[PDB]
Structure 1
Amino acid sequence: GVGISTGTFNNQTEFKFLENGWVEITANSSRLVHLNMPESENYKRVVVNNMDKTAVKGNMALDDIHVEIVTPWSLVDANAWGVWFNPGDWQLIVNTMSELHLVSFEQEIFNVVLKTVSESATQPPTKVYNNDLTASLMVALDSNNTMPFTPAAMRSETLGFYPWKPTIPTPWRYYFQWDRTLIPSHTGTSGTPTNVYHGTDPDDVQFYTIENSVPVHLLRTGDEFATGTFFFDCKPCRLTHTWQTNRALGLPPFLNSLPQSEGATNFGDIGVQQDKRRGVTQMGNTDYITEATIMRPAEVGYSAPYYSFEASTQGPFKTPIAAGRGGAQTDENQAADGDPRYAFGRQHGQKTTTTGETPERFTYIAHQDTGRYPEGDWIQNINFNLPVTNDNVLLPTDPIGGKTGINYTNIFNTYGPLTALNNVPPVYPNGQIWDKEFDTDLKPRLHINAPFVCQNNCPGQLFVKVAPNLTNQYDPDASANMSRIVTYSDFWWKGKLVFKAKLRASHTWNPIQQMSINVDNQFNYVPNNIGAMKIVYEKSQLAPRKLY
C-alpha cells in the first residue's frame, strides 16, 4: 500500500460556543517531522563532570555534573503553548475568556516515509536519495507512564511553532542516580573545598528500556498510527490577575476630611489620632491602629530565601519560589519572587533568519501583585516604641554573618497557615502546558513549570525511532558497530488538544487591559521580505479580579 495517503493535515483552531458562556476550544496542529538514524544502537550510561569550572572557588552555582542514560530513541514532545495557538488565537483567549479547562489530548502519525542515502562517489561526488518501501519506522506510546517523565519544553526542545516549517524530535535521555559532593566557597576561600562525584548508589539504580516495557509498533509507508483520546484531570486555570495586597483588604478608614478642590495634592484626611482610633489589631502593646498595622484576614503572598541553594545526595540546587509581582513596574527583584526567564531560538520564536547560536530570551513578569519588595521589609523589637532606634530594628541594610551583601530578607521565610497564593500563569508561547504530579506521599501545592498538573493520570510519552536497516554484512559475534544502510524517515504528526473556556463579564465602569496590535508590535506578527518569522511572548492574565 504505497500509493495511498493515510492522513490529513489540519492546523485549525475551532471555537465552539455553547450555552451559558462556555466555549469549547479545539486546537488542531499538524507538522512534518524529519527523523534520522540513531548515531548508536545501544543505551549508554554517560557521566557529565565539569569540575574544571567548579574547581574555581566561588563557582558552585555553575555545577553541571550528573549521570544520564542515553537512549537510541527520540521523543515527540508537543507540550508547549506555541505548538497549538498563534498570536491571533492567543489574543482571543486572553482578552475574552475568564478561565481555561484542559480537556483532552490525542495524536496520530501518518503518511510515513523512509529514504535511503546513496553516495554516488563520483566527481563532486554525488548523493542519491531513494525510497526504501519495505523499511519501517518504530513507534512506542508509553501509555502506562512506565518511563521517567521528561518535558522537552524545559529545554526548548518541543515541536516547532510554525505550521509551514518542518520540525524534528529530540533524542530521548533520562537521569541515572549518582552521589556528588560540592562544598561552597568564595574567591578568598583557602585550601581546596571538596568537589567529589562519588558515583551511584546500587539501591537507587533503575535502568529503563523501551523494548522491555512498552509494546513497539512498526510502520511502513502504508501504515499509520493513532493514539486514543486521553482525558485530563486538572483544576481550571484562571485568566485574570489579582492586584490586592494586604494593604488593600477590607474596609478603608473613614475620611473625616475630604479634599474640596481638584489637584493631585489635595488629599483626604482620616481625621483621627492614630492612637485614638477604633478597630482591631494583632499588636497587644501599642494603641496605634495604622493602615500598615491594622488587622487583615490572612496574608496574600509570602517571603522566601532568595538565591538560596540547597544540597542533597545529588548536589546543589536553587530553591524554587512561587510568586508574582510585588513592587513597582521597572522596580522588581527578579530573584525574590522568581520571575522566570526563557531561552530559546529560531524554531520556537527567535527571528528565523538569525545567525550564530546565542539564544533569544525574556524574563516573564506576571500582572498579579503577589510578590515582595525586600527593601521595604524591616523588623522591630517587641516594645514597639517609635521612632524606632537602630538597636531595635533589623533592616534589609544591616548585614548578616558580618557579610556586607547579605541581610535577613535573604534568609527570610514567612510562609504559614495564613498564606494566600495563586498558581503559575500560562506563558505564551514558550511555556509548558501540563505536568505530571510528583509521586511523593505529600504533594506540592503547585508546580512552578506549568499551570496544569494532571494528577491521577497524564498522556503517555511518544517515542519514535528508525528501525535498523542492515547491510549484507552483519556479525553479532564481533563488537564492531554493525554497518547499516544510511536511512532516514519523514512522517506527519497531528495532534488535537481540546480546551473548555468561560466567557468573561464586565463588572466595572472602567475599561480593561486588552491585548492589541500597536504601531510598535505590528511587525512582530508578520513575516519580512525574506520570509523571516519570530514569535514574541505575550502575557495571559491581563484583566483584574477582586481577591476579597
Structure 2
Amino acid sequence: GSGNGSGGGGGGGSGGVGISTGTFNNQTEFKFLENGWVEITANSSRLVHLNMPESENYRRVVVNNMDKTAVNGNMALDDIHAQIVTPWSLVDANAWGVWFNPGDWQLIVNTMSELHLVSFEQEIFNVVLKTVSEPPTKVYNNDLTASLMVALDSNNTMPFTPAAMRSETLGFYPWKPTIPTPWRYYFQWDRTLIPSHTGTSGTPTNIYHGTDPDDVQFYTIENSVPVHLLRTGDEFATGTFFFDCKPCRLTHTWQTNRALGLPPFLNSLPQSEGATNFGDIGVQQDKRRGVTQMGNTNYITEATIMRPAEVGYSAPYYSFEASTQGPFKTPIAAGRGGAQTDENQAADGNPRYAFGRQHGQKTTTTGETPERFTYIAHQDTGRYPEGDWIQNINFNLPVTNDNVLLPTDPIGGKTGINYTNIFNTYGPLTALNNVPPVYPNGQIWDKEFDTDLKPRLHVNAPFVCQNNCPGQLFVKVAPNLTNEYDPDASANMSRIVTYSDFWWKGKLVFKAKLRASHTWNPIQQMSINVDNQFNYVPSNIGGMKIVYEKSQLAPRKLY
C-alpha cells in the first residue's frame, strides 16, 4: 500500500529526475527560396508506449499453413516461411502519413513539380518507466532507476525491414499515442510446392525441406550494435542523415505511343460545330507519305506509323514464379488506369493498401476489418490487354482468323487464358516512370538491393537510396528482475512487470520546386468540397480518418 518512496533528483546540464529533456514539435515548415525552390521541413513527434517483451529470448520459428495450400488450387495461399524473433522492437517512421497532414499534402501537390528528399534525423526523450503491482487494484509506480534500451543500427548490419509494408509504422496522429513493433526477420529455408487446380488428381508435392546450412545467418542486436541505456534523465539522439537519391516528380505523363510526334496533316476540316463533325486526313491510307517499321506494306496509319520508341511495356499476369523458397507474384511497374477501368477493371500493377485505425481507418469505427483502397496512378503508362493482338507477317488484310492471335483465343487449350497472360514486351526501347508516392500510406524511402545488377526502380517507394540508408532504430525494455533468479535454472525468468513511455521526435527534410503555368487551360488540382468535406474533420466524438490522395496531378509533355 506504499508510493515506493519518491526519489530525489540530482542535476546535470542535459538532464535529471524532474527535468524534461525534450521539446514537442510536430509542425511543418515551408521555406521559400530564390528561384522557386522550397525547403520543406517536417517535424513530427509522438508519444510512444512500449511493454516488456514476452520473453527475453531470440527464437527461431517456422510457420506452416500446409493445410490451407493442401487444398489444390490454393497455391497463392501459401504462407510458409522461417523467421527469427527478437525481443526487440522497431521504431519505424518511414511513411507519408507520419509526416504530413492533408493540408500539407495539398499544398505540395498542387504547387510543386518535383520533390527531393534531403535529410532526416530523430531523437528520443522524456523517458519514463513504471511498474505495475497488484482485490484487483492495479497500482503503478515509477521505477526511477530502471532503464530503457536503445540501439541504432547505423551500420545497417541488420536485414532491412521496412514496416510500412505491413502497416506498422507509427501512427499518423500527433495527438494520439502509438507504438513500435516487435522486431523479427526472415530466416532462411528451402521449400517446394507444385501448383495445381480444382480438377487436379492426388497430392502435388508440397513440402518444407529445411535449411541450407550455407544460406544461414543469425544476427543479434547485442552482438552488433551498441546499446544505450537511458534512465529518465537520459535522452538520446541520432545525428542527421543525408540522402543520396533521385528526385520524384509530381507530374504525370499522358501521351502513349499514339501521341508522339507530328500528327498527320488534315486536308479536310470541319465547317461547323458539333461532336460529329470530324476532320479528314484525306489521303488513301496506302498512299500517304511517311515512315514505318513495317517492310511489307504501304499502309500508314496512326497505328502503323513509326514511333521513336515505346512507352510502357507488357508483362505476364497474374504471374507466379518460384525459386528456392516458394512461389511469389511477379511484379509489374506500370499498373493500368484510365477510362476503361474505374477500380473495377482494377488489375495488375495497381497497388492496394490495407490498414488499421493507427493509419487512417476511422478511429471510431468498430470491428476489426481493415480499410482499404487501390491506388490508381494518373500516369497513363499501363496496358489494356484486351486491346492487344498479334498477326501474321504477311499482313494481308482485313485479316483472317488463321493469321491472328487474340486476347480471345485460348492458349494451351485453357479457356480463361490468352497470350496476353504470358506475354512480355519489355525491351531496349521501353521507357517509363517511377511509381508515384502514395499518401498517406506509402513508404517513403527504401534500401537498394545488394545485387550486382539492379532494378531500375522499386515499387514500394519512390525514393531508393543509392548508398546506405538510415539505420534502423530499436528499442526495448531492460529486464527488471525480482530477487529470485537462477540463470542456472531451466525455467523462464520472472521479471517485474515493467513498461515504458517516451517521446519521439523526428525531422525530415525535403526540397522541392514550385511549378509554373504553361498551358492556357488550367489544370487539375486537389481541393475540398461538399463531398469529401467530412473526411477532413473529426466527428462529434473525435472520430478521425485519413483518406488517401493522389500525387502526380499535373501533366507534362513526354515528348
TM range (shorter): over 0.9
Cα contact 2:337–2:346 (8 A) shared by 1: no
Distance 1:326 1:277, change over 3 A: farther
- Cα distance between partner residues in 2 of 1:463 and 1:68: 18
Cα contact 2:150–2:227 (8 A) shared by 1: yes
5 Å-filtered alignment, 1:16-165, equals 16-119=31-134, 124-165=135-176
Cα contact 1:153–1:432 (8 A) shared by 2: yes
Task: Please say which of residues 528-537 and 329-338 is displaced more in the overlay.
Answer: 329-338
SS of the residue corresponding to residue 322 of structure 2 reads: strand
Shift, 1:327, TM fit: 4.3
- Cα distance between partner residues in 1 of 2:345 and 2:120: 34
Shift, 1:336, TM fit: 5.1
Shift, 1:328, TM fit: 1.7
Gaps of 5+ in 1: none
Shift, 1:104, TM fit: 0.2
Shift, 1:155, TM fit: 0.2
1:537 and 2:537 matched: no
Per-residue CA deviation, residues 344-396 of structure 1 (Å, 9 max, x unaligned), is 01000000012111100000000000000000000000000111100001000
Shift, 1:125, TM fit: 1.9
Distance 1:337 1:62, change over 3 A: closer
SS of the residue corresponding to residue 290 of structure 1 reads: coil
Name the TM-score, length of structure 2 as normaliser.
0.96
Shift, 1:331, TM fit: 5.0
Per-residue CA deviation, residues 37-60 of structure 1 (Å, 9 max, x unaligned), is 000101000000001100001000
- Cα distance between partner residues in 2 of 1:61 and 1:352: 32
- Cα distance between partner residues in 2 of 1:398 and 1:201: 44
Cα contact 1:298–1:418 (8 A) shared by 2: yes
Cα contact 1:324–1:369 (8 A) shared by 2: no
- Cα distance between partner residues in 2 of 1:254 and 1:19: 44
Identical-pair percentage: 98
1:5 and 2:20 matched: yes
- Cα distance between partner residues in 2 of 1:45 and 1:430: 31
Per-residue CA deviation, residues 171-223 of structure 1 (Å, 9 max, x unaligned), is 00000000000100000111110110001100011000000000000000000
SS of the residue corresponding to residue 14 of structure 1 reads: strand
- Cα distance between partner residues in 2 of 1:148 and 1:452: 19
Per-residue CA deviation, residues 288-321 of structure 1 (Å, 9 max, x unaligned), is 0000000000000000001100000000000000
- Cα distance between partner residues in 1 of 2:160 and 2:202: 41
Aligned to 2:246: 235
Please report the RMSD computed on the Cα atoms of aligned residues, expressed in angstroms: 0.9
Which of 425, 432, 448 matches 1:421? 432
Cα contact 1:110–1:224 (8 A) shared by 2: yes
Distance 1:417 1:326, change over 3 A: farther
SS of the residue corresponding to residue 555 of structure 2 reads: coil
Per-residue CA deviation, residues 270-294 of structure 1 (Å, 9 max, x unaligned), is 0000000000000000100000000
SS of the residue corresponding to residue 426 of structure 1 reads: coil
Gaps of 5+ in 2: 1-15
- Cα distance between partner residues in 2 of 1:58 and 1:97: 48
Distance 1:46 1:38, change over 3 A: same
SS of the residue corresponding to residue 347 of structure 1 reads: helix
Shift, 1:140, TM fit: 0.1
- Cα distance between partner residues in 2 of 1:444 and 1:479: 48
5 Å-filtered alignment, 1:186-205, equals 186-205=197-216
Shift, 1:330, TM fit: 3.4
Cα contact 1:305–1:336 (8 A) shared by 2: no
Cα contact 2:336–2:347 (8 A) shared by 1: no
- Cα distance between partner residues in 1 of 2:136 and 2:478: 28
Cα contact 1:281–1:289 (8 A) shared by 2: yes
Corresponding residue pairs, total: 544
Name the TM-score, length of structure 1 as normaliser.
0.98
Shift, 1:325, TM fit: 3.4
Distance 1:279 1:392, change over 3 A: same
Aligned to 1:359: 370
